[PDB]
Design a binder for this molecule. Structure first.
Ligand SMILES: CCOC(=O)[C@]1(CS)N[C@@H](C(=O)O)C(C)(C)S1
Ligand SMILES: [Zn+2]
Ligand SMILES: [Zn+2]
Ligand SMILES: [Zn+2]
Length: 231
């Protein structure tokens, strides 16, 4: 049922409804000779929508907005990017031109500037220490510590028990580590443990790339990271 990388042409975006007022968005991109899928989230906020992450580039993000209008028909008023890589912030300028207020932590904004990626306009305060959580409308934002990147955030939707792990959480089909150039391998398992301790009630866990599962995705990611550490 959930769309896989093999079913989505690059340039098109699919929506997958998880619960009342909660969807993921799925897009694909060519990178380094291969095609990869990528996930983000959409959460209803009264008569408006909160977006988590772009759809990996300007063209995909324009298609994302069009697919939201077609399938949901409510305006995206705010967006949060969960780390500084281009699959999370590429398309921010499209969002801004459409009137969306774009947000990220100060860490993420700094790292995006250094890398030359697009920079969300607004700053999320209260997330600079491991274990910090803040409310953002219908979600909670959580900084678990450094993992896939030093700035990575996770997002929890309490009304639906949906945990969006972003790129700090791997899908089951990925059995070897991905791009870890910006990672903190030594801390990544401890950061995952903070996620488990804070959201032990989660029922639906979404990785940054690939198929959702349950909290077993956390143990899976720990296994893969530790195997890479022991290479
Ligand atoms: C635009 C560049 O973005 C990347 O390089 C990412 C960011 S998470 N890392 C890659 C990887 O892990 O191989 C990927 C293809 C999953 S997207
Ligand atoms: Zn990344
Ligand atoms: Zn603003
Ligand atoms: Zn990613």
């Amino acid at each position: 049922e959930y769309p896989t990388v093999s079913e989505i042409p690059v340039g098109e975006v699919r929506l997958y409804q998880i619960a009342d007022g909660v969807w993921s968005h799925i897009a694909t991109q060519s990178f380094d000779g291969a095609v990869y899928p990528s996930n983000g989230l959409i959460v209803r906020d009264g008569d408006e929508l909160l977006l988590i992450d772009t759809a990996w580039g300007a063209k995909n993000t324009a298609a994302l907005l069009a697919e939201i209008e077609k399938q949901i028909g409510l305006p995206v008023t705010r967006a949060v990017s969960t780390h500084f890589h281009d699959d999370r912030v590429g398309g921010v300028d499209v969002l801004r031109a459409a009137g969306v207020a774009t947000y990220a932590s100060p860490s993420t904004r700094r790292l995006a500037e250094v890398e030359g990626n697009e920079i969300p306009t607004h700053s999320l305060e209260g997330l600079s220490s491991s274990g910090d959580a803040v409310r953002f409308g219908p979600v909670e934002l959580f900084y678990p510590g450094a993992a896939h990147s030093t700035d990575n955030l996770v997002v929890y939707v309490p009304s639906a028990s949906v945990l969006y792990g972003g790129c700090a959480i791997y899908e089951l089909s990925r059995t070897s580590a991905g791009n870890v150039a910006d990672a903190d391998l030594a801390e990544w398992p401890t950061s995952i443990e903070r996620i488990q301790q804070h959201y032990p009630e989660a029922q639906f866990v979404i990785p940054g790339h690939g198929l959702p599962g349950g909290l077993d995705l956390l143990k899976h990611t720990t296994n893969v990271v530790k195997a890479h550490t022991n290479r």
